[PDB]
Write a structure and sequence with these properties.
The structure is cut from a larger assembly and holds one copy of chain A (about 250 residues), one copy of chain B (about 220 residues), three copies of chain C (about 200 residues) and one copy of chain D (about 110 residues). The longest helix of chain A is centred in the C-terminal third of the chain and has 25 residues. Helix content of chain A is about 50%, strand content about 10%. In chain A, helix 8 packs antiparallel against helix 9. Chain A has about 250 residues and is mainly α. Chain A contains ten helices and five strands. Chain B has a two-stranded antiparallel sheet. Chain B is mainly α and about 220 residues long. In chain B, about 75% of the residues lie in helices and about 5% in strands. Chain D has one domain: ATPase, V1 complex, subunit F (Rossmann fold), CATH 3.40.50. Chain D has a four-stranded parallel β-sheet, sandwiched between helices. The chains are: A mainly alpha (about 250), B mainly alpha (about 220), C mainly alpha (about 200), D alpha/beta (about 110). At the A-C interface, helix 2 and helix 7 of A face helix 4 of C. It is classed as proton transport. Keywords: Membrane protein, proton transport. Rat Kidney V-ATPase with SidK, State 1.
């Protein structure tokens, strides 16, 4: 790792330069030196607030919500310094982190970022208060290019089907938790109780990780299958029967 | 009337979004309540049709057993109608909390003592014992049918109330919040334009003062 | 201007500060003091402070996590009661609301002007929370131990048998840190733990 | 405390349920049933029905399907959920579901 | 602009003027003219005018007060009716709802393009309002007296038994100030007062 | 933005463009490709294309009209289907729903990765829809012509007498212009029309 630190009390113009150094180093490491590179831009909100100051420094009139009109091009000038290029093994991936003002995606910082970037992960206060660390809410989250990332010879061949079935079972588990809240346990079916057992175990084994336990994709899928095995084989409606026959048994 | 009359501010946008999540949550919870009660109401209607078919059969058998009793006992009916004391069978009311609502039902209770114990000793008492048991089975099925009726009418009321709460959220409360939110977002974009215009004029005045200050040095 | 945390001074402050004690109009209006919203506030120093806590106060981290969990499950249960009333609530959900009321009204709540509550030392603080959450665990066990059994130990059976212990639990806040030193407070709270365990033992 | 069933019907229907153990005199000596002769007027059945559905002791009223149709106006006007009214068949009379006041209230039924 | 009273011309005007006749587009759409919204509108000169009204119409301040009470109770009941429909109301509430609709349709509305409503002299104004509020008081007393007993009067029983009175009350606008002299209008309105009194005495 | 069409670029674009192909996530999640919503989509060019259609495909204007009607009846009937169950609807509604399903799943859906749905010529598009709507007109005639009679037709009676016709209608999508000449596809569609007419002749 190469680490760039810009502090809250460091100059606002050095905060604009920090992403550009990071991406210049990531471009060098990947495109001059073949490295696969992951860039972690840890607070795009304070970058956007720095752009607001640099625009005020030129006496420019403020645009949308007090940010510069050209904020989309400046965010794009950071985010599109990424991807693979023809005839080189190097590649810059970016995982920005972005503190949503007022917890609202409509704000220009998250809003313009959603337009430029290929999907988003949400950290959620609900999971955080429940002590689920990491607090990553897998329901609103979407990695747009996950269809490319997952396949035979890149992971286990079952992976895409596992993620789809886990999504359905966690979503239905949440829907059944809303049903439980209205009807109480004695009114639920056996299947509803399985989606509740799934939801409890899924948050407490799949999502909950701790700050230092490392899970490779293989172990995440075995955890996934350990949660999917809660249901009878025929209930796993988004997995092909061939995949079930190869991996449902534990 | 059309809006909640909250004055437009970035605070008011936040409060309307909080209330919209509240109203959409309340809609979904009351929709789950409606679905759960509707499932029970359809099940209870199915049970009413089945229980009325069973009631048809036990009542045909019991009514046929009256003809048998009139065979071997003669006119026992006048004796039975005229001599009445205490009920051997009584009902107690009970509450069921199923589907997150209170549904009333009845339980079949029996006091042992036969109010017609000696009827038919002269003739017909064997056939009257068969008749007594058949009408007891009819009464058991009717206490269940009453419990289905009291449940059914209580669910009819509770579904109508719950669907009114859901539609009131969907067609009054949520539309007031959505129109109010669209208004607040609109007036906030208007305030943003006023500040853009005011600041463009300030910058123009500064540009003119810069130029004049340079011209005065020539 | 209206208590709104989206205001630019708050937004700039929130990007900088490691601790934020979000006081809430609804709590202040109902005269809940000290009016801190326990679902909006945060402290990024927990990571570091857990070294001190694990050296001097090993029970406290488990209690801190269980406290915030109980308080968040209170919001879930409190929201649904507006529509469903009590009818859906499991006996564990009742025990969650009862202990959440104890933790909200008799631990989080504190009178800033009355000598019993003007300041609360940490030994009193951890001991109060230790008792309230030890009650939650033992009560939750007492319910769940009877799942599918011939007889259920209900929230009401608990609440009736534990009535003295519930009054003792709420009373923990009254110990004077000046006249009742930490040794005396810890000793009294150790008697509450023993009384609590023995009161639950009558149902197990 | 409990409640009792009550009956409005012909001699045979009443006799059947009395042998089923249904019959009790109230403390005022009034019974919990009415026998209906062919010459009985609408006011006798209807005033009895209006009494039975409003009395404190009666929890269920059984009505012979033919009488239930002769009193159909007051019967379908009875909207209270607890004091239940059962339309019942009899030996020379229509079947159990004929114009039934509860079956007609369902939208889901064809 | 856009019919929004928050507009700065309106805002600055209402900081100065002592009478506000706010016209509501939703009433104008329904062709309820004059479209003055009676909840929104105010007059600050009423105290200064009560000293004049007492010299000519001692009954007027009672009637004006009762008119606002009827409309306020109806607007507050409407917040329930919009969510539950016309079903759950008490008989007094249905009387309030229907007399407020009578007042809306036949007192507050005025068809300024017709011989009968081109202008409305003040005597016709107090007369019409006096008859409608007399109906309200009598209808209210009839239910509130009889609801304590088996022989309960209902709002429907009043509507059905007194349908000609409701039609007569609604007709009162059509009196022509040029052709129907002031004495004749007062006499016709006194016949309505006596017709009501006789019909309520027949319900009692 | 978030599916809100009121943004000025989207609102102006849908105000300017004479055609809109309303792709919908709810269709794509079920793999209903091309995933175009047949209620939200529109085309203003029909009046101009009718010249070409009247020359080259004179039957098509009746067919597209009836297709939209059948699809609109499915959306309007679906509320009744949820409210009282499909089994409680009339026979004319039941056959309407089945043809709407046949159109939705075997005409409007098109799997462009397959050899058969790779491309669909306009002749094949007319011939598929012509057969589906011909079956609808005959089914509708049979149920409506026998309504209120002693002997009556319903969807189950049709399906029992001619289930092979519903299968043959579904098979039409698999017929491939690369394998089968246009004359052969036209002859097969003429055969399905004769087959369904002779099948209905057993009932009427």
């Amino acid at each position: 790792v190469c680490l760039f630190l810009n502090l809250a009390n460091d100059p606002t113009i050095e905060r604009i330069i920090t992403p550009r150094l990071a991406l210049t180093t990531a471009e060098f490491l990947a495109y001059q030196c073949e490295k696969h590179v992951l860039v972690i831009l840890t607070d795009m909100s304070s970058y956007a607030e720095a752009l607001r100051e640099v625009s005020a420094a030129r006496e420019e009139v403020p645009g949308r919500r007090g940010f510069p009109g050209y904020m989309y091009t400046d965010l794009a000038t950071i985010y599109e310094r990424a991807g693979r290029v023809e005839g080189r093994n190097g590649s810059i991936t970016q995982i920005p982190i972005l503190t949503m003002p007022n917890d609202d995606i409509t704000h220009p910082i998250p809003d313009l970022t959603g337009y430029i970037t290929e999907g988003q992960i949400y950290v959620d206060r609900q999971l955080h208060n429940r002590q689920i660390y990491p607090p990553i809410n897998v329901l609103p989250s979407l990695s747009r290019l996950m269809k490319s990332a997952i396949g035979e010879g890149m992971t286990r061949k079952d992976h895409a089907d596992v993620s789809n079935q886990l999504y359905a079972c966690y979503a239905i588990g949440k829907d059944v938790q809303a049903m439980k809240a209205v009807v109480g346990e004695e009114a639920l079916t056996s299947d509803d109780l399985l989606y509740l057992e799934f939801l409890q175990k899924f948050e407490k084994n799949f999502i909950t990780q701790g700050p230092y336990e490392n899970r490779t994709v293989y172990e995440t899928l075995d955890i996934g299958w350990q949660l999917l095995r809660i249901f009878p084989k025929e209930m796993l409606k988004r997995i092909p029967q061939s995949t079930l026959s190869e991996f449902y048994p534990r | 009337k059309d809006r909640i009359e909250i004055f437009p501010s970035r605070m008011a946008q936040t409060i309307m979004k909080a209330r919209l999540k509240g109203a959409q949550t309340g809609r979904n919870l009351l929709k789950k309540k409606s679905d759960a009660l509707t499932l029970r109401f359809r099940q209870i209607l199915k049970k009413i049709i089945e229980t009325k078919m069973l009631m048809g059969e036990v009542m045909r058998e019991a009514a046929f057993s009256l003809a048998e009793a009139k065979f071997t006992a003669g006119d026992f009916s006048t004796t039975v109608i005229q001599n009445v004391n205490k009920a051997q069978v009584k009902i107690r009311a009970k509450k069921d909390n199923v589907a997150g609502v209170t549904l009333p039902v009845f339980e079949h209770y029996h006091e042992g003592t036969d109010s017609y114990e000696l009827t038919g000793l002269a003739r017909g008492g064997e056939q009257l014992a068969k008749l007594k048991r058949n009408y007891a089975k009819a009464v058991e099925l009717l206490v269940e049918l009453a419990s289905l009726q009291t449940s059914f009418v209580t669910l009819d009321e509770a579904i109508k109330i719950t669907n009114r709460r859901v539609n009131a959220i969907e067609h009054v409360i949520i539309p007031r919040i959505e129109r109010t939110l669209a208004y607040i977002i609109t007036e906030l974009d208007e305030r943003e334009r006023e500040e853009f215009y005011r600041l463009k004029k300030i910058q123009e005045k500064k540009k003119i003062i810069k130029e004049k200050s340079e011209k005065d040095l020539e | 201007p209206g208590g709104d945390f989206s205001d630019p001074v708050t937004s700039a402050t929130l990007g900088i500060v490691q601790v934020f004690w979000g006081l809430d109009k609804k709590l202040a209006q109902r005269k809940h003091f000290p009016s801190v919203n326990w679902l909006i506030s945060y402290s990024k120093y927990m990571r570091a402070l857990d070294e001190y806590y694990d050296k001097h106060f090993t029970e406290f981290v488990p209690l801190r996590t269980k406290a915030k969990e109980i308080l968040q499950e209170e919001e879930d249960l409190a929201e649904i009661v507006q529509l469903v009333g009590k009818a859906s609530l499991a006996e564990t959900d009742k025990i969650t609301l009862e202990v959440a009321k104890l933790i909200k009204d008799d631990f989080l709540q504190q009178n800033g002007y009355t000598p019993y509550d003007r300041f609360c030392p940490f030994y009193k603080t951890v001991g109060m929370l230790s008792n309230m959450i030890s009650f939650y665990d033992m009560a939750r066990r007492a319910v769940e131990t009877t799942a599918q059994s011939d007889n259920k130990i209900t929230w009401s059976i608990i609440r009736e048998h534990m009535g003295e212990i519930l009054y003792k639990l709420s009373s923990m806040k009254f110990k004077d840190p000046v006249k009742d030193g930490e040794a005396k407070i810890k000793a009294d709270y150790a008697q509450l733990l023993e009384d609590m365990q023995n009161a639950f033992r009558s149902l197990e | 405390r409990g409640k009792l069933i009550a009956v409005i019907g012909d001699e045979d229907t009443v006799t059947g349920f009395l042998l089923g153990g249904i019959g009790e005199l109230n403390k005022n000596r009034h019974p919990n049933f009415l026998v209906v002769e062919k010459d009985t007027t609408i006011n006798e059945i209807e005033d009895t029905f209006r009494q039975f559905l409003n009395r404190d002791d009666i929890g269920i009223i059984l009505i012979n399907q033919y009488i239930a149709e002769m009193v159909r106006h007051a019967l379908d006007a009875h909207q209270r959920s607890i004091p239940a009214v059962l339309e019942i068949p009899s030996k020379e009379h229509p079947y159990d579901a004929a114009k039934d006041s509860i079956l007609r209230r369902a939208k889901g039924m064809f």
